[PDB]
């Protein structure tokens, strides 16, 4: 599960890339004051990630995953409730399957032995070619 919906993440609490999940993995760039006038900026801050989004049918990404400045895997996603199109909240298509991406093994080390296979998914008239990693734990 995702702890909470996606909000604004100031750049320096993040270490490494911020991957958000439209079905196809995507890396999100930062934004300065000119790009977020309504964010209550602090004089410490210069750049932030705007991760707010509804589900990609109408929004941008189902969810996002990055790593804390302290080295901790943090995730965000849409509120929980065509399998993953209504209830997706991150890279997890099902409770057993996540979307593969170059940083999956660091963010999610427990998925080392998952089997991977290529799938396709239509979202909003756009086809997404994905690799999925799957299977159980005892």
């Amino acid at each position: 599960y995702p702890p909470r919906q996606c909000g604004v993440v100031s750049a320096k609490t993040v270490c490494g890339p911020v991957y958000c999940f439209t079905p196809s993995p995507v890396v999100v760039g930062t934004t300065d004051r000119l790009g977020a006038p309504t964010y209550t900026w602090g004089e410490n801050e210069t750049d932030v990630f705007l991760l707010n989004s509804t589900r990609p049918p109408l929004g941008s990404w189902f969810g996002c995953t990055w790593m804390n400045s302290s080295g901790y895997t943090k995730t965000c996603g849409a509120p929980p409730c065509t399998t993953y199109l209504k209830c997706g909240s991150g890279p997890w298509l099902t409770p057993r399957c996540l979307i593969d991406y170059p940083y999956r093994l660091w963010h999610y080390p427990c998925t080392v032995n998952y089997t991977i296979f290529k799938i396709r998914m239509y979202v909003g008239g756009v086809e997404h070619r994905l690799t999925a990693a799957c299977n159980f734990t005892r």
Partner: antibody
Amino acid sequence: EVQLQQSGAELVKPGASVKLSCTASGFNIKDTYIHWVNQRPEQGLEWIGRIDPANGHTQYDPKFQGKATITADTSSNTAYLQLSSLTSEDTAVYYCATSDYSYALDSWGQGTSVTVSS
Amino acid sequence: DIVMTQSPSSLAMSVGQKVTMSCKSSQSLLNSNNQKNYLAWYQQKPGQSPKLLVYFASTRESGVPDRFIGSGSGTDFTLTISSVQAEDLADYFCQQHYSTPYTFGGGTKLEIRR
């Protein structure tokens, strides 16, 4: 569908080799299998082989084993089909195609015409 | 190799007529764990490259009109055009995507009467 763009038509001498390319646009070629199919003039379709570019893993029709080599560069999002010791029989259109796990060819390039003549 | 045989070689239909074309594989294409028959139908319009019409014997590819219906199982499969349209002018190929080498049928030619 997804976008595959193949290289231009070629003329090859008998006994020489040809290398055709197939570039992906709008998706990462690592997330698909790339198959190569040929079609001779006014004839049917014939599967040549396929590559998984995520690890370079190839399968072929064994009658093309040796004569055909399929490669893939994910740096440039491009697959390649090389054919050696070409004969006049090899004159044909060569398509590249994508598939997922099912291996059904869901998207096809426009084809590259290859003519073998002296 | 799995031999795929199509019938008839050519058809001549007017706009709105219903038509059926047949494909038969030398070997069953069923995966019992899937209950799926790994058979696909491709359409090639004049001067064009093939496009996937149907896969898994009956699953219509997204965007393909409702009038195209794949059916069959075991070794016998059919493609039906419930109301032939002018744009359906094409060669139609069946193909098993079950085991390598993946093999195609000889195709069925669909011409239009007017």
